[PDB]
Amino acid sequence: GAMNSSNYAELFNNDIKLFVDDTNVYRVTVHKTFEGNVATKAINGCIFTLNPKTGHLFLKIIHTSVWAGQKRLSQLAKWKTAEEVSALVRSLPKEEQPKQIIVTRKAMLDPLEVHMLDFPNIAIRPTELRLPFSAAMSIDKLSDVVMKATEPQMVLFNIYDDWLDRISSYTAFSRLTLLLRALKTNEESAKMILLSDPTITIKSYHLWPSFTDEQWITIESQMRDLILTEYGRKYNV
Amino acid sequence: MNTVPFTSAPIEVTIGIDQYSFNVKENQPFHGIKDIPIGHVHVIHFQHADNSSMRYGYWFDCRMGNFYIQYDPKDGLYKMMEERDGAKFENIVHNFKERQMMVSYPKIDEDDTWYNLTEFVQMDKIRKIVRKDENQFSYVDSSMTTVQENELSDPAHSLNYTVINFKSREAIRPGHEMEDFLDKSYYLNTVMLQGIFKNSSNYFGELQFAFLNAMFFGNYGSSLQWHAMIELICSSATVPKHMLDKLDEILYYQIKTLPEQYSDILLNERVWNICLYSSFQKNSLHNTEKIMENKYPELL
Ligand SMILES: COCCCNc1cc(Cl)ncn1
Numbered sequence: 001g002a003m004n005s006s007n008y009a010e011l012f013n014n015d016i017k018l019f020v021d022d023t024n025v026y027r028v029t030v031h032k033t034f035e036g037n038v039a040t041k042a043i044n045g046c047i048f049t050l051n052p053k054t055g056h057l058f059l060k061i062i063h064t065s066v067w068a069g070q071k072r073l074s075q076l077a078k079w080k081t082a083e084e085v086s087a088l089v090r091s092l093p094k095e096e097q098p099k100q101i102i103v104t105r106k107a108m109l110d111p112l113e114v115h116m117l118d119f120p121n122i123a124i125r126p127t128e129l130r131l132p133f134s135a136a137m138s139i140d141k142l143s144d145v146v147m148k149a150t151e152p153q154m155v156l157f158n159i160y161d162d163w164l165d166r167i168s169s170y171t172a173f174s175r176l177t178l179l180l181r182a183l184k185t186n187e188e189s190a191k192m193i194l195l196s197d198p199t200i201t202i203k204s205y206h207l208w209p210s211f212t213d214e215q216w217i218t219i220e221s222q223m224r225d226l227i228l229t230e231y232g233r234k235y236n237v
Numbered sequence: 238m239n240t241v242p243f244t245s246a247p248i249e250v251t252i253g254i255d256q257y258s259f260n261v262k263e264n265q266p267f268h269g270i271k272d273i274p275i276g277h278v279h280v281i282h283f284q285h286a287d288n289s290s291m292r293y294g295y296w297f298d299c300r301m302g303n304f305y306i307q308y309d310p311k312d313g314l315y316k317m318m319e320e321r322d323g324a325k326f327e328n329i330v331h332n333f334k335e336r337q338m339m340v341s342y343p344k345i346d347e348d349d350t351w352y353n354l355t356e357f358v359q360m361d362k363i364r365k366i367v368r369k370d371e372n373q374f375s376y377v378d379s380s381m382t383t384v385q386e387n388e389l390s391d392p393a394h395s396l397n398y399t400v401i402n403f404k405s406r407e408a409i410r411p412g413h414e415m416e417d418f419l420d421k422s423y424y425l426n427t428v429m430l431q432g433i434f435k436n437s438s439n440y441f442g443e444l445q446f447a448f449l450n451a452m453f454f455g456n457y458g459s460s461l462q463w464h465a466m467i468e469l470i471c472s473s474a475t476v477p478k479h480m481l482d483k484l485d486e487i488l489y490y491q492i493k494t495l496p497e498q499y500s501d502i503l504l505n506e507r508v509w510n511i512c513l514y515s516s517f518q519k520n521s522l523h524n525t526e527k528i529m530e531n532k533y534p535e536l537l
C-alpha cells in the first residue's frame with residue numbers, strides 16, 4: 001500500500017523500485033498579454049524517476065512541443081508522465097524492471113496503473129512521505145540540460161555521485177533529501193552553503209561538490225540550520 | 238392470469254411477490270398466489286420470521302411451466318417445484334380457489350411499476366446469469382456472490398454477471414490509455430454493446446436484473462453490478478440518444494420503488510454524485526436527477 005515512516009527501510013532492500021515525481025513535468029510562466037489578460041507560456045520540464053538504492057536517475061526531459069495543440073495540460077501531464085514511465089520500464093531488460101513504482105503524488109496512481117496494466121506484477125504505490133523532489137530543478141546541471149533541450153530526450157544521472165563508495169544508500173538518500181529540502185526552503189542560501197568555498201569543486205561527471213567526509217558533516221549541519229532558520233522566519237519562532 | 242400454489246405454510250414467513258409482500262403465520266390455511274399477470278417475469282421471495290438472515294427467492298415466468306411452492310423440512314426452505322402433470326396441476330389448483338385460500342396478486346390497473354422495472358429482463362437470459370439448467374426457474378439469495386467477487390467461492394452457486402472493470406485491458410486500448418479511461422465510450426459501445434451484450438435491450442435487462450436482486454435480497458454483488466453498469470454509461474461521452482432516454486426512465490422507476498429506509502445501503506454516494514453532477518451525462522438524466530434530488534437530497 002502506501003509508503004511512510006514505518007516502512008522506510010524498504011527503500012533500500014534488494015527489490016528494484018523507482019520513485020516517480022511529476023511536479024516538474026508541466027511548467028509555465030504566467031504573464032500579461034498586450035490586452036491586459038493573462039496567458040501562460042510553457043517551458044521545458046522533466047520527469048524525475050529515481051532508484052533510491054542505486055542513485056540512478058532517469059531524467060526524461062519534456063520539451064514544450066509535447067503540449068502544442070493540447071487541452072487540459074495539467075491532466076495530460078500526468079498521463080504523459082505515466083506513458084513515459086511505462087515506456088522506460090518496457091525498454092529495460094526484465095531483470096532490471098522495477099517490482100514497485102512509488103509515485104510522490106496520489107494523482108499519478110490511476111494514470112500509471114492504467115499505463116502499466118500489461119505489468120500486473122509491478123506494484124504501483126503512493127507514499128505519505130513529503131519528498132522534496134520538486135527541488136530537482138535547483139540542481140544546476142539538471143536545470144541546464146532541461147532548459148537547453150530542443151527535443152524530447154532522456155538523460156541518465158547518478159544523483160548520489162560517488163557517495164555509495166563511502167556511505168550506505170540509506171545515508172545517501174537522507175543526505176539527498178536534506179539537500180533538496182534546503183534548496184526548496186531557501187534556494188539562494190542552500191546554494192551559497194554548497195558553493196561558498198571555491199576550493200571544493202564539482203567534478204565534471206558529478207552533480208554535487210567533492211566534499212570530504214568531515215566537510216559533508218559541516219554542510220549537513222548548515223542545511224539543518226537553514227531549514228530550522230527559515231522555519232522561524234516563516235512562523236516567527 | 239396464472240397461479241403459484243403452495244403445499245402448505247409450515248413456518249411463519251414474510252412472502253414477497255414482485256414489489257408486494259405479506260405475512261403468513263406458522264401453519265396458517267394458505268394455498269398460494271393467484272391472478273399473477275402473464276407476460277412478465279416475476280419473483281417470489283421469502284424471509285423467515287425466526288431468521289431474517291437469508292432472504293431468498295425464485296425468478297420464474299408462468300408461460301414456461303406450472304410451478305408450486307413446497308416447504309422442505311430437511312433443507313429448511315420454501316422450494317419452487319414444477320408439476321409436469323398439467324392435468325394434475327389443474328386438478329390440485331381448482332379446490333384451493335373454490336376454498337379461497339390464496340392471495341390475489343394485487344395489481345392496480347393504473348400501475349405500470351412492475352413492467353417499468355422488468356421491461357428488458359428475459360427469463361431465458363436470467364438462467365444464463367443464474368446457472369442451474371435442470372430448472373426453468375432461478376434461485377437467488379442474499380449471500381450469493383458474483384463471478385467478479387470470486388476473482389477478487391463455489392462456482393455453481395454464483396451470479397454470472399457480465400464482468401465490468403474500468404482498469405482492465407478489456408476496457409483500455411493500447412495507445413488510448415488516457416482517452417479510454419476518461420471517456421469510456423469504446424468500452425461501452427464496442428466491447429460491451431456490440432461485443433458481449435449484442436444490443437442495449439440486453440444491457441438494460443442485466444442492469445434491471447442486478448437492481449432487483451440488490452433490492453429484494455440485499456445482494457451486495459448485484460448492487461455493485463447495477464452501479465457499474467450505470468457508471469459505464471454516464472462515463473461515456475458518446476451514447477445513443479435513445480439509450481440515455483431509456484436509462485433515465487429505468488433509473489427513475491428504480492429510485493421511485495426503492496424503500497426509503499434502504500437508500501443508505503443500496504445507493505452508492507460516489508457513483509450517483511459523479512453520474513448526476515460530474516459525468517458526461519450529467520445533463521441527460523432529467524427524470525432521475527429530479528426524483529433523486531427530491532427523495533434523497535442527503536445522498537447528494
Ligand atoms: C407433493 O405435492 C403433490 C402434488 C405436486 N404438484 C402440485 C402441488 C401443488 Cl401445491 N399444486 C399443484 N401441483
Ligand SMILES: COCCCNc1cc(Cl)ncn1
Nearest residue numbers: 358359362399439442443446
Ligand atoms: C452475462 O450476462 C450477459 C447477458 C445479459 N443479458 C440479459 C440479462 C437479462 Cl436478466 N435479461 C436480458 N438480457
